[PDB]
């Protein structure tokens, strides 16, 4: 069900959560002064969520969240990334550089304190009410001096909610000694990673395992051999009971951004500039790359990862544009704004309408700039690799940047072909007068011939090939460098990119100010029960049910995938559909232990109507009694519009069944000590 | 449910059909001496099925069955193919050249008569028992002389069933004055034709309408303005009641070929030679074409139809190979043969085992020939367009064939690129000693360089370009013609193709003889109740239920598609997903008359567990009471293995809901006179 709720809103949502099946007492889920399930959720390394799953500090998160650490410890001698990793004793758990888990020790509503302090600011249009610097100076003041002395490992932060109509202060407890314990092989962790990105059904065992280490008294400590496992205040019990269609499910984690309070005009802008441009440009770029990768095996090797990273946000944009076109997103925001405008007229209060027209007017005014901005960023800055060629003892410094640019995955021939297709589109859309200066040479010097222009850049640039770089220096002429067509291209586009960004930047603030007023209206009118605050990287809960959906006429996706699905998808030639041979043998023997359903089918993943976004990677998924039933890892493309409007009949969180995580730990890892330390319940 | 049953087997299947829901009396469906529903089914123009749907001779069949006739009557002035056609009076119904509908007036079991007559044939290995000539001489003898004089429009034919263990005689009544009445626009008739070939869900309104005209007494007559509508003996009532999940459904029509009695060894051969070769070669050819069509808009125009025709059997082979790999087809045939072999040992009868080993031994022996045959047919004869370049007043005759070969859809550059890829694969697989002679020049004259060889063919052939043809004649040297590299290529490959076909041909007869014995065993052992005779282009019935299925883990396709599905798929830029504007407006207004379900959803198509194959295009689909509920038009790719082994959990007939046909006649055609003449019942 809809929304990413504040902990403070639990009481407002409690009735609704019970209607959907919640059996826990409010206090056991969250409370302000004691121990609750909230104390088992962590913010894992800056973005991801994770969860404490034993009384000795074991932490579960996704495989994609732990990927950097597993990769850091991997060698060709011990390739943990391909094979998995299972530490067979606590002493073999691997420390990690520059890692953190944060617990949210305390949350406090400080809206009154902040609005009082904001009264000193004389200027009515100051943006200090959202300034991270200013809010932290308020935080530090409220926490008193000596705070850090009196509270090992604690810190404070104030954040704005509801466009600056509400402020919370969080007290955070940060551990930096977090050690890798367990990871399945990549074939399991990344099963279908690219082809099935944003797809349900899904068959990925997307998990990894860490442990929080600390001092003898549980205080945060920097890494040392004398640190011991944290004995946490609360950890999750692990359910073996599974899930059924319609079962209650809930998630806590740290969603990043949403846009629930867009006006109709911002929706139109989001479609017609941001999404349309990303779609057109990435389709061009992807289409040339693909053609090259198909034609040449070595180019598939060099480019498949740049190809997949492009497709990631491309797919998201397609899905968002689909919702706009088919699910009524613009109309929903139109109705929200017209409701408040009728209401305000009746209250004799014109400021809500004026705020909506201010937003409208700013979006209208910035239109051509924004379009130019997106065209250049999607078309060139991201789209053409040689846009990031180097710009000027110092030759050795230049060589380093050249080497990074023309690295072992770079093909000058692919880059030229990509550039020709992207610039042809860019030049059709951007008129001569608004071009980055160097691109005026297409008309002026090459008579409209984009292939000739791009050919010339490579023919004469000292960065056009290694021998061209080697011959340049060798015999540096400084002199040649100042006329280099690549350098002048690169400089020229980044100069236009920069100047566009600077002229657009100021248009943000009027919109932000009006949103304060807009959201204040909405909340006065209808209250907060069905108007969640936009996500802002802070702890939130969401609740829903275990449920499939219909993607299109006469097709249904159910709520649960199985191991039978993995084997169906098995392809030993494609690295993303490789099946691990120990998991294959488990399947052949039906060696499922107590983790399969009564009918002998082994669950892999499930989906639910919870409301999640980027930042909910690794989030624990709880059942009606708060026991762990799964780990959140993706969402379906039909639901990406849900950052703007939740879609009950389409949006799903995609979740790894905790029974499958246990299976993999047991039968693939053989890591029995990790099951015995968890509290595994019926 | 399984099988394509003889009319004569209706009594054997009757109990089973009633268990599935049939409420008709046996006699009303089929009987030997009176009127039954069988008298409303026709064999439409040689291959398709159709059905009589009024007391004035209206005939329903598929749009793809009627396509040639609609296309024959179409002009740029009156393009009936794009717009549809609706004759607003009987006098405006269009006659068609060289068309037929055949009714099966009588069927008679003549096995005894034929086995008696076969006793004259002295040679035990004569293939006369399956010879169409010989069986027709028996037919004519049995029908007496003067048969055709005493029976206007009647003819007789004998056919072999069950590998020559059963013979039926049919008396056929043939009408040649069959006029086009009604056709939806192609956008409806062919909605998704290519992209959704062999796909369920499906959204195609695949129907057309004809009328049988005859003399004043209902006798067949050649076309004349004095002919009148046939007043048929039986026609189908049309149901408006629709279908629900699990409803009984049945079909009669004219299935072509099946291979129910394959041995395990024939299954392995079918996979590893016929299907593997068609898959590899067509994937190569398709992959070069696609690359070209993507690169050039004019090449997409010229080649999309050759591209789709290749994909048609390619897709079927993929689906068949999928069933072999995942659905146990080889094992089913192994078990059938080992059952009969244990049985025969117990009967003290070794001839069933010896028959199975004879088949085995023939398949083994022909293996390399068959492989060579398929390689050359898929790789070159079908795969390379210039293999069918011309082979030599007579220059004008040559020019005609050249013009057909190098027509407005032919690209020499595409042809060369295709040829290079196909010959590279062909030459890797076929050793020098077995090559068509001209292809030995790749090794011998061009040092392994297939691009140089193919380039030379085009450089020097008088068929390599129009100017090259024009310059040749002009100045014919005969002399140049006898050395022409294309002519010598063409001749060379057709010579090898021919010689392979001739050496393979004789291997068919031992297999056929052993199948007689093999099937005789199977039928002695288990009887005919669950062992249908292989399809042989004769009238058969099949029964099943209206039911969806699961294609893969966690996905379900339901039993019924709707108009909502058409609109979801709408793409005005792609000709196959164009939605007709009158159907679009109908949808927008929900102008569904009495044709939609109680919930306001308008059905388009449904699927059922009946057992169909090629030749069931246009087959009537009946409900429990024999009323028409739909028109069969395709089957799903998961079920194409069903020609060898029926798959209950996968194989479906794909059927146009008769309520959608009525909707289209009414709201798109405006052809009310066609509804008023039908008998439309609740
Ligand atoms: K994703
Ligand atoms: K987001
Ligand atoms: K088909
Ligand atoms: K067939």
H, E, C per residue of A523-565: HHHHCCCCCCCCCCCCCEEEEEEECCEEEECCEEECCEEEHHH
Contact predicate A618/A60, CB 8 Å: yes
CA of B197 to the centre of ligand 3 (A): 5
Report the alpha-carbon distance of residue A36 to residue A24 in Å, rounded.
11
Sheet bearing A555-557, strands edge to edge: A549-552, A555-557, B555-557, B549-552
The pairing of strands A680-681 and A238-239 is: parallel
Domain match, B325 and B294 both: yes
In eight-state DSSP terms, residue A534 is P
CA of B658 to the centre of ligand 2 (A): 47
Q: Give how far the C-alpha of residue A396 lies from the chain's centroid of Cα atoms, to the nearest Å.
A: 37
A-side interface with B, Cβ within 8 Å?
Answer: 201, 203, 291, 294-295, 548, 552-558, 560-562, 564-565, 568
- A547, A550, A554: which to substitute to probe chain B, counting the most B Cβ within 10 Å? A554
Report the alpha-carbon distance of residue B344 to residue A112 in Å, rounded.
95
φ/ψ of B632, rounded to 5, equals: -70, 140
Task: State the helix-helix crossing angle for B485-504 and B450-460, rounded to 10 degrees.
Answer: 120
Report the alpha-carbon distance of residue A189 to residue A61 in Å, rounded.
11
Domain match, A506 and A603 both: no
Domain match, A508 and A544 both: no
The answer to whether B553 contacts A201, with C-beta atoms less than 8 Å apart, is yes
The token pair at A413 is 């021939």
Question: What is the number of other CB atoms lying within 10 angstroms of the CB of residue B405?
Answer: 18
Please list the active-site residues of B: 64, 206, 617
Residue with tokens 């490789």: A578
Closest CB to A554 among B553, B554, B560:
B560
Helix (H) or strand (E) holding B156: strand B154-161
Domain match, A148 and A248 both: yes
Expressed in Å, this structure's resolution amounts to 2.0
CA distance B294 to chain A (A): 9
Largest CA distance in chain A: 79
The token pair at A369 is 């700039």
Question: What is the number of other CB atoms lying within 10 angstroms of the CB of residue B307?
Answer: 17
The answer to whether B201 contacts A568, with C-beta atoms less than 8 Å apart, is no
In eight-state DSSP terms, residue B77 is S
Contact predicate B65/B620, CB 8 Å: no
Q: Catalytic one among A206, A484, A534, A634? A: A206
Closest CB to B555 among A201, A294, A295:
A201
Report the alpha-carbon distance of residue A359 to residue A219 in Å, rounded.
48
Which residue in A67, A105, A290, A88 sits closest to A189, CA to CA? A67
Last residue of a domain, one of A504, A527, A550: A527
Last residue of a domain, one of A478, A511, A527: A527
Contacts 24+ apart (CB under 8 A), A122-125: A125/A509, A125/A513
Which residue in B27, B146, B3, B1 sits closest to B533, CA to CA? B3
- N residues, chain B: 682
Q: Catalytic one among A389, A411, A461, A617? A: A617
CA of A47 to the centre of ligand 2 (A): 12
Question: What is the number of other CB atoms lying within 10 angstroms of the CB of residue B90?
Answer: 15
Closest CB to B555 among A203, A291, A555:
A555
Contact predicate A504/A369, CB 8 Å: yes
Domain match, A201 and A261 both: no
Domain match, B229 and B324 both: no
The token pair at A116 is 């009082």
The helix/strand/coil state of B588 is helix
The pairing of strands B628-635 and B620-622 is: antiparallel
Sign of CA dihedral B372, B378, B384, B385: positive
The answer to whether A558 contacts B561, with C-beta atoms less than 8 Å apart, is no
Domain match, B638 and B562 both: yes
Kindly compute the dihedral angle of the four CA atoms of residues B332, B336, B341, B347, in this order, to the nearest 10 degrees: 150
Chain B residues within an 8 Å CB radius of A552: 565, 568
φ/ψ of B226, rounded to 5, equals: -85, -5
Task: State the helix-helix crossing angle for B485-504 and B351-376, rounded to 10 degrees.
Answer: 180
Report the alpha-carbon distance of residue B496 to residue A398 in Å, rounded.
64
Sign of CA dihedral A636, A640, A642, A645: negative
The answer to whether B565 contacts A556, with C-beta atoms less than 8 Å apart, is no
Task: State the helix-helix crossing angle for B412-429 and B450-460, rounded to 10 degrees.
Answer: 140
Contact predicate B230/B212, CB 8 Å: yes
DSSP bridge pairs for B167: B160
Domain match, B237 and B290 both: no
CA distance B291 to chain A (A): 8
φ/ψ of B120, rounded to 5, equals: -65, -35
Using a 10 angstrom Cβ sphere, with 0-12 exposed, 13-18 middle and 19 or more buried, the burial of residue A626 is buried
Helix (H) or strand (E) holding A360: helix A351-376
CA distances from A52 to A46, A90, B60 (A): 17, 16, 67
Chain A residues within an 8 Å CB radius of B558: 554-556
In eight-state DSSP terms, residue A86 is E
Q: Identify whether A116 is preceded by a cis peptide bond (ω within 30 of 0).
A: no
Contact predicate A558/B554, CB 8 Å: yes
φ/ψ of B252, rounded to 5, equals: -125, 140
The answer to whether B561 contacts A553, with C-beta atoms less than 8 Å apart, is yes
Contact predicate B252/B540, CB 8 Å: yes
In eight-state DSSP terms, residue B236 is P
The answer to whether B556 contacts A560, with C-beta atoms less than 8 Å apart, is no
Report the alpha-carbon distance of residue B260 to residue B263 in Å, rounded.
9
CA of B634 to the centre of ligand 3 (A): 5
Report the alpha-carbon distance of residue A398 to residue A406 in Å, rounded.
12
- Ion ligand 2, residues whose Cβ is below 5 A away: A 257, 613-614, 643
The answer to whether A561 contacts B568, with C-beta atoms less than 8 Å apart, is no
Question: What is the number of other CB atoms lying within 10 angstroms of the CB of residue B119?
Answer: 7
The token pair at A87 is 């530490």
Sign of CA dihedral A409, A411, A412, A417: negative
Largest CA distance in chain B: 79
Report the alpha-carbon distance of residue A653 to residue A639 in Å, rounded.
9
Preceding residues of all breaks in chain B (C to N beyond 2.5 angstroms)?
392
Using a 10 angstrom Cβ sphere, with 0-12 exposed, 13-18 middle and 19 or more buried, the burial of residue B127 is middle
Alpha-helical regions (H) of B212-347: 264-269, 276-295, 297-326, 329-347
Chain B residues within an 8 Å CB radius of A649: none
DSSP string, A257-289: ---TT--HHHHHHIIIIIIHHHHHHHHHHHHHH
- R_g over Cα of chain B: 27
DSSP bridge pairs for A440: none
Report the alpha-carbon distance of residue B401 to residue B674 in Å, rounded.
45
CA distances from A332 to A263, A352, A647 (A): 9, 17, 11
DSSP bridge pairs for A48: A44
Q: Give how far the C-alpha of residue A622 lies from the chain's centroid of Cα atoms, to the nearest Å.
A: 21
Preceding residues of all breaks in chain A (C to N beyond 2.5 angstroms)?
392
The helix/strand/coil state of B494 is helix
Last residue of a domain, one of B527, B542, B566: B527
Contact predicate B488/B438, CB 8 Å: yes
The helix/strand/coil state of B417 is helix
Domain match, A495 and A544 both: no
The token pair at A195 is 């082809």
Report the alpha-carbon distance of residue B633 to residue B58 in Å, rounded.
19
Helix (H) or strand (E) holding A156: strand A154-161
For A295, name the nearest residue in chain B, comparing CA atoms only. Answer: B291
- R_g over Cα of chain A: 27
Contact predicate A618/A62, CB 8 Å: yes
The helix/strand/coil state of A424 is helix
Contact predicate A623/A23, CB 8 Å: no
Which residue in A223, A13, A253 sits closest to A99, CA to CA? A223
End-to-end CA distance of chain B: 27
The helix/strand/coil state of B654 is strand
The answer to whether B565 contacts A548, with C-beta atoms less than 8 Å apart, is no
Residue with tokens 């079909």: B251
CA of B258 to the centre of ligand 4 (A): 5
- B191, B553, B555, B557: which to substitute to probe chain A, counting the most A Cβ within 10 Å? B553
Contact predicate B640/B319, CB 8 Å: yes
φ/ψ bin of A189: left (φ > 0), alpha (ψ from -120 to 50), beta (otherwise): alpha
CA of B13 to the centre of ligand 1 (A): 53
The token pair at A220 is 């945060």
The answer to whether B564 contacts A553, with C-beta atoms less than 8 Å apart, is yes
Task: State the helix-helix crossing angle for B351-376 and B329-347, rounded to 10 degrees.
Answer: 150
DSSP bridge pairs for A364: none
Report the alpha-carbon distance of residue A620 to residue A236 in Å, rounded.
9
The answer to whether B556 contacts A555, with C-beta atoms less than 8 Å apart, is yes
DSSP string, B81-146: HHH-EE-SSGGGPBP-TT--EEEEEEEEE-HHHHHHHHTT---TT-SGGG-HHHHHHHHHHHH-TT
Report the alpha-carbon distance of residue B490 to residue B384 in Å, rounded.
10
Sign of CA dihedral B90, B91, B93, B95: positive
CA of B380 to the centre of ligand 3 (A): 24
DSSP string, A440-477: HHHHHHHTT-HHHHHHHHHHH-TTSSHHHHHHHTTS--
Answer yes or no: A148 catalytic: no
CA distance A561 to chain B (A): 6
Helix (H) or strand (E) holding B398: helix B394-405
Answer yes or no: A559 catalytic: no
CA of A204 to the centre of ligand 2 (A): 22
The answer to whether B548 contacts A557, with C-beta atoms less than 8 Å apart, is no
CA distances from A430 to A321, A375, A433 (A): 23, 8, 8
CA distance B420 to chain A (A): 14
Q: Please name the residues in contact with B102: beta carbons below 8 A apart, sequence gap of 6 or more.
A: B42, B43, B172, B173, B174, B175
Could you tell me the residue range of the domain that residue A387 belongs to?
257-527
The answer to whether A554 contacts B201, with C-beta atoms less than 8 Å apart, is yes
The token pair at A112 is 């009154």
Helix (H) or strand (E) holding A557: strand A555-557
Report the alpha-carbon distance of residue B610 to residue B13 in Å, rounded.
14
Method of determination?
Answer: X-ray
For B605, name the nearest residue in chain A, comparing CA atoms only. Answer: A554
Report the alpha-carbon distance of residue A201 to residue B160 in Å, rounded.
49
Contact predicate A507/A127, CB 8 Å: no
DSSP bridge pairs for A249: A544
Contact predicate B622/B250, CB 8 Å: yes
In eight-state DSSP terms, residue B274 is I
Q: Identify whether A604 is preceded by a cis peptide bond (ω within 30 of 0).
A: no
Domain match, B336 and B414 both: yes
Report the alpha-carbon distance of residue B517 to residue B520 in Å, rounded.
5
DSSP bridge pairs for B250: B543, B622
The helix/strand/coil state of B573 is coil
Domain match, B449 and B558 both: no
Helix (H) or strand (E) holding A563: helix A563-569
The token pair at A337 is 């704004």
Helix (H) or strand (E) holding B491: helix B485-504
For B201, name the nearest residue in chain A, comparing CA atoms only. Answer: A554
Sign of CA dihedral B379, B380, B381, B385: positive
Report the alpha-carbon distance of residue B605 to residue B242 in Å, rounded.
11
Q: How many CA atoms lie within 13 A of B650 on its CB side?
A: 21
CA distances from B374 to B269, B361, B371, B641 (A): 12, 20, 5, 20
Contact predicate B637/B623, CB 8 Å: no
- B199, B554, B560: which to substitute to probe chain A, counting the most A Cβ within 10 Å? B554
- N residues, chain A: 682
Using a 10 angstrom Cβ sphere, with 0-12 exposed, 13-18 middle and 19 or more buried, the burial of residue B502 is exposed
Domain match, A573 and A504 both: no
Chain A residues within an 8 Å CB radius of B654: none
Report the alpha-carbon distance of residue A68 to residue A178 in Å, rounded.
13
In eight-state DSSP terms, residue A637 is G
Chain A residues within an 8 Å CB radius of B565: 552-554
Alpha-helical regions (H) of A30-131: 63-73, 80-83, 111-118
Report the alpha-carbon distance of residue B110 to residue B140 in Å, rounded.
13
CA distance B655 to chain A (A): 14
Which residue in A611, A613, A615 sits closest to A44, CA to CA? A615
The helix/strand/coil state of B638 is helix
Kindly compute the dihedral angle of the four CA atoms of residues A181, A187, A190, A193, in this order, to the nearest 10 degrees: 170
Total domains in the fold of chain B = 2
């Amino acid at each position: 069900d809809e929304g990413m709720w504040l902990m403070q809103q639990l009481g407002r949502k409690y009735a609704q959560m019970k209607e959907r099946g919640l059996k826990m007492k409010e206090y056991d889920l969250y409370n302000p002064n004691g121990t609750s399930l909230k104390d088992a959720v962590v913010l894992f390394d800056g973005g991801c969520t994770g969860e404490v799953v034993s009384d000795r500090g074991l932490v579960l998160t996704n495989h994609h969240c732990g990927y950097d650490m597993i990769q850091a410890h991997s060698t060709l001698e011990h390739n943990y990334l391909e094979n998995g990793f299972w530490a067979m004793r606590e002493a073999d758990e691997l420390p990690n550089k520059d890692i953190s888990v944060v617990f949210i020790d305390k949350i406090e509503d400080v809206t009154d304190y902040v609005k009082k302090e904001l009264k000193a600011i004389k200027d009515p249009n100051s943006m200090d009410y959202l300034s991270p610097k200013y809010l932290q100076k308020l935080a530090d003041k409220k926490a008193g001096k000596n705070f850090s002395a009196k509270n090992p490992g604690l810190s404070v932060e104030i954040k704005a909610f509801y466009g600056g109509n509400l402020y919370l202060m969080f007290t955070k407890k940060t551990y930096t000694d977090v050690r890798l314990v367990g990871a399945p092989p990549s074939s399991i962790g990344k099963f279908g990673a690219d082809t099935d990105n944003w797809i349900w059904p899904r068959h990925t065992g997307d998990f990894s395992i860490f442990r929080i280490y600390a001092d003898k008294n549980g205080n945060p400590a920097p890494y040392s051999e004398d640190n011991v496992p944290l004995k946490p205040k609360r950890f999750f019990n692990i359910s073996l009971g599974g899930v059924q269609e319609n079962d209650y499910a809930m998630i806590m984690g740290f969603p990043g951004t949403t846009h629930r309070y867009f006006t109709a005009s911002e929706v139109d802008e989001w479609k017609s500039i941001d999404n349309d441009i990303r779609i057109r440009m990435r389709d061009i770029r992807q289409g040339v790359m693909l053609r090259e990768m198909l034609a040449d095996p070595q180019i598939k090797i060099m480019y498949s990862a740049k190809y997949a990273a492009s497709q990631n946000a491309y797919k998201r944009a397609i899905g968002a544009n689909w919702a706009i076109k088919t699910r009524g997103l613009r109309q929903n925001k139109q109705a929200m704004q017209d409701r408040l405008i009728a209401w305000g007229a009746k209250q004799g209060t014109p400021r809500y309408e004026e705020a909506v027209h201010e937003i409208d007017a700013t979006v209208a005014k910035r239109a051509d700039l924004r379009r130019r901005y997106w065209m250049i960023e999607e078309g060139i800055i991201r789209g053409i690799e040689f846009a990031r060629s180097p710009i000027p003892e110092a030759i050795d410094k230049i060589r380093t940047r050249y080497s990074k640019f023309a690295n072992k995955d770079y093909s000058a021939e692919v880059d030229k072909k990509v550039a020709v297709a992207m610039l042809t589109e860019y030049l059709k859309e951007i008129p001569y007068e608004n071009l980055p200066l160097h691109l005026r040479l297409v008309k002026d010097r090459f008579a409209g011939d984009v292939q000739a222009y791009v050919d010339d850049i490579f023919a004469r640039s000292v960065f056009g090939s290694e021998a061209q770089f080697d011959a340049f220096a060798a015999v540096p002429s400084v002199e040649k460098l100042a006329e280099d067509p690549m350098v002048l291209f690169a400089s020229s586009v980044f100069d236009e990119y920069r100047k566009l960004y600077n002229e657009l930047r100021p248009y943000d603030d009027p919109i932000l100010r009006a949103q304060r007023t807009y959201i204040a209206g909405l909340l006065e009118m209808d209250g907060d029960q069905d108007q969640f605050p936009d996500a802002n990287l802070t702890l939130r809960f969401t609740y829903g049910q275990v449920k499939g959906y219909s993607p299109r006429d006469n097709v249904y996706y159910g709520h649960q995938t199985t191991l039978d699905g993995v084997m169906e998808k098995e392809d030993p030639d494609n690295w993303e559909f490789v099946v691990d041979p120990k998991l294959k043998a488990v399947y052949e023997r039906k060696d499922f232990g107590r983790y399969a359903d009564r009918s002998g089918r082994m669950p892999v993943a499930f989906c639910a109507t919870t409301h999640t976004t980027g930042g909910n990677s690794g989030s624990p998924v709880m059942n009606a009694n708060g026991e762990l039933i799964g780990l959140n890892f993706d969402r379906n493309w039909e639901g990406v519009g849900g950052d703007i409007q939740y879609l009950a009949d389409y949006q799903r969180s995609i979740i790894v069944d905790i029974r499958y995580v246990l299976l993999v730990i047991d039968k693939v890892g053989g890591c029995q000590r990790l099951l015995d330390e968890m509290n595994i319940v019926p």
